[PDB]
From a paper:
First, the MCM helicase is loaded onto duplex DNA as an inactive double hexamer. Activation occurs after the recruitment of a set of firing factors that assemble two [name]–MCM–GINS ([name]) holo-helicases. Here we use cryo-electron microscopy to image ATP-dependent [name] assembly on a chromatinized origin, reconstituted in vitro with purified yeast proteins. Our results explain how ATP binding nucleates origin DNA melting by the [name] and maintains replisome stability at initiation.
To understand the conformational transitions that occur upon [name] formation, we determined the cryo-electron microscopy (cryo-EM) structure of a dCMGE complex assembled on chromatinized ARS1 DNA. Both C2 symmetry and asymmetric refinement yielded a structure with limited resolution. However, symmetry expansion approaches revealed that the two rings in the dimer are identical. By overlaying two copies of the [name] monomer to the lower-resolution dimer, we can therefore obtain a high-resolution view of the entire dCMGE assembly. While in the double hexamer the tight homo-dimerization interface is formed by the packing between six MCM zinc-finger domains (ZnFs; degenerate in [name]), the transition to dCMGE involves the loss of several trans-ring interactions and a one-subunit register shift for the remaining tethering elements. The residual inter-ring contacts involve the [name] ZnF that transitions from an [name]–[name]–2 to a [name]–[name]–6 interaction. As a result, the two [name] particles in the dCMGE complex become splayed open, pivoting around [name] and creating a large cavity that exposes 1.5 turns of duplex DNA. The intervening DNA appears to stabilize the dCMGE dimer interface. In fact, although [name] formation disrupts the double hexamer interface, we found that the complex maintains a two-fold symmetric character, by forming a [name] dimer that is stabilized by both protein–protein interactions and DNA gripping. In fact, when [name]–SCFDia2 is superposed to our dCMGE structure, an extensive steric clash can be identified between the E3 ligase engaged to one ring and the [name] subunit from the opposed ring in the [name] dimer.
Author numbering:
A (entry chain J): 1 to 58, 68 to 146, 159 to 194
B (entry chain K): 53 to 294
C (entry chain P): 2 to 37, 48 to 200
D (entry chain O): 1 to 208
E (entry chain M): 2 to 94
Amino acid sequence: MGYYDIDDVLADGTEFPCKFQYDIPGLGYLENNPGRPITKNTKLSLPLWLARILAIVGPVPFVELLPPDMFSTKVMNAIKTDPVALDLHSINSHFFSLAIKWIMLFSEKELANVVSELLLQRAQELNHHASSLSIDLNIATSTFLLKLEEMEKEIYKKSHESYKDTKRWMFKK
Amino acid sequence: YVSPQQDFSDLMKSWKNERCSPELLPYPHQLMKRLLNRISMQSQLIENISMGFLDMQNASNANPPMPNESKLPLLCMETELERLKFVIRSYIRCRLSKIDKFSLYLRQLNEDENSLISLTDLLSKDEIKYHDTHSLIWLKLVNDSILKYMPEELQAINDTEGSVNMIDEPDWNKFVFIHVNGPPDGKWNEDPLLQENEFGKPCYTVTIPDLKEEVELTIGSIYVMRYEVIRDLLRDDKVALI
Amino acid sequence: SLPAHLQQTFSPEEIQFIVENEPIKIFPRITTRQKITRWQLITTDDKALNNMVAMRSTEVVLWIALLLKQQSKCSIVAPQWLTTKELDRKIQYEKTHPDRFSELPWNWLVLARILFNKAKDDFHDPIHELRGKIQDLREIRQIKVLKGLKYLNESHLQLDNLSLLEINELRPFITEIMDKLREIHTASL
Amino acid sequence: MYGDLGNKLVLEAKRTKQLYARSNQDVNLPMYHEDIIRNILKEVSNLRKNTEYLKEQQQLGMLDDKVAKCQYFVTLLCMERNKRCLLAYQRLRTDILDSMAWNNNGLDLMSSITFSQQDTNNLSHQEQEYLKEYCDLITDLKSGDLVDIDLSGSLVPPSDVFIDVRVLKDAGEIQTEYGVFNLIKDSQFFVRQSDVERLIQQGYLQKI
Amino acid sequence: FGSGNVLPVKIQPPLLRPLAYRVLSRKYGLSIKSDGLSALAEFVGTNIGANWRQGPATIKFLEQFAAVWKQQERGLFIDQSGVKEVIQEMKER
């Protein structure tokens, strides 16, 4: 609920599938069809700042939210099998924010049990890669930091900076 | 009171609590006044000795202040004043930043009739002037830039009924590091909250209602805990933010 | 305050400040006893500094001791835990109990670094041996911290004897991970 | 659709934040985005016209109410989204300006001598005005009850009484309390830290 | 800024620079140059009679000298123009 947060604003503009449950004229720029009015039982991808509200006001609301592609059974199975190796960036750049949003709109205890485990298992690798300060006298870090969500990069940067400052102060001669 | 060491201890504990806390802590009105008066007198004192040493030197080409038992005391005065001024400066600027972050929330608190929290206690007078001036300047900027081209239905910078709440409030469940000091002064039997445990020193008890559990904090241990369940202990100096 | 992060975490220099705001023992090389200019400090008790006699043990705040040792008017005595015997006892205690932290003072790393930098002559043991022992302790403490990081949740954690610098270098990761876990749990209620 | 342009603006803000985040030294804000902002202004004006038209077309009673409610909600939501994007961009730029204003020891910034961190023409006119009143607010703070403490002073703790400094730029003799410093270029000084904090902050001295 | 005192006693700037430094360099403004400091000796010596132990007079003089430098853009270093700005100050009154 951060009004001025940039990342929340960006993540809140993603497109979700949905179906119109009524028949209404005057629309159509949603379909990029200006003059054509929208019919009943039409499936379109609408942005989240619109689909969230259109599914509340009606009783039956005007629009029904359809299951997303990023929360399918395949993605859950891939998360469960191997959390660290999975490329969450390819799935979506804002996986976690949309995950808590989806849990909030629709109370789903199963998703809350999977996302928590995924985050907990990826935190260990994040700490391992953040603590590795190079000494002057690997492919793993470059490979892993390309699989990081938008939220996880902030934590990586903070941890890395703190470790470097601590090491710098310890060995200042 | 009437101890200059305890004033410095209290200032340090207030600064340490201020940096790590999410909310805007109450202002220690008396302590700041005493410290500012002490600084004002001390600066005059060092100035007085400096002038006295300088004036006599030029009169009859006399010797400078004889080096033994002379330089080190005054050097210590200067460095001690420098450290104290730094501590107070950091405290003030940190609380000013926190004031900047929560302008609308403070305004709503002040505008509410049935609110025990009042800005005359939580905010210093200079901080009140800062808040009032900054709010007006920011409102002028946003009104001239964007809000003028908007429908009358939505022209308010504070809207609690819109799609997203425009008033941000402090995070009341932030995770913090705490140390259990125990009683502020002593008399462990006097404190009613203290309760003994098995083969151990007395431990405080708190409850987490969302989790619905009871957590015991033993004295002398460091904990990572929610901020809300520990507000009373921190207010009563039983725990200290590290 | 605002610039260069500093919003919710202390810098190493501020930790050093807090450490130097703590007392230490010295052997004065000068006598400033009153006869039968004075210090008159405002944040620390000046009774010991005013009444000083040579070749006797007194205690003052740390930064005054460093300022005096900058001149030739002081000699700081290192704490008793800065010895090879007392460090080897703690190493053994650290080895035997793999699920608790040893009881070291909350400023051992900062104090060790400061004393090695400033008062190198005052130590009785060779300094390289102590410097090796400090690293030996730090590595094992790091192993225990790495093992303990696995038990992160939404309720609370207990880190009984972790040092100040160790807490500072780990705070941003721990706090944010538990905060995100707490939001995920709260959302499902 | 309607708000798809404003997202671009938000994206730009993100990039600026990175320059703010990855900043070893102070940086300058990029160019203003008055053209994109004017485009959102035009589209929100068109949305206002559409809302008006819906108002008349409903109040003549040719259309069902349930039908009109949907487009009313859509227009309202699009305007709210555009307002959110514009306000977020403005607040980020305002925060960076406040940080710079604090990090120049108060003063009037662009009118007087500046540290050359920022060009005049990057900022908008309203931003230029805002900066002026914010600097005046800092100034009359510094003359408040906290005169003895320099609220615009250094924020790194003092831990070294005597320091070695080197002059970067040539200058003349400067009087200090109880003495004089002669700023001959390529010369080294061994002096107390308190005397030279001001000169180090203004770029006439190096090292600490 | 006033006249009619006993006579303009001459004193060295060494006994004048601490007050000017504390008022200007520390709080607001800076760079009191040596030549500028010598220039600022004459006008304060014009009314020198029974001063350096007095109350507001010197502080108000330094305040008024700061007023020009807030008003005019000027610069940092104080040069032989220091009398030129006091001419402007007496023009103002």
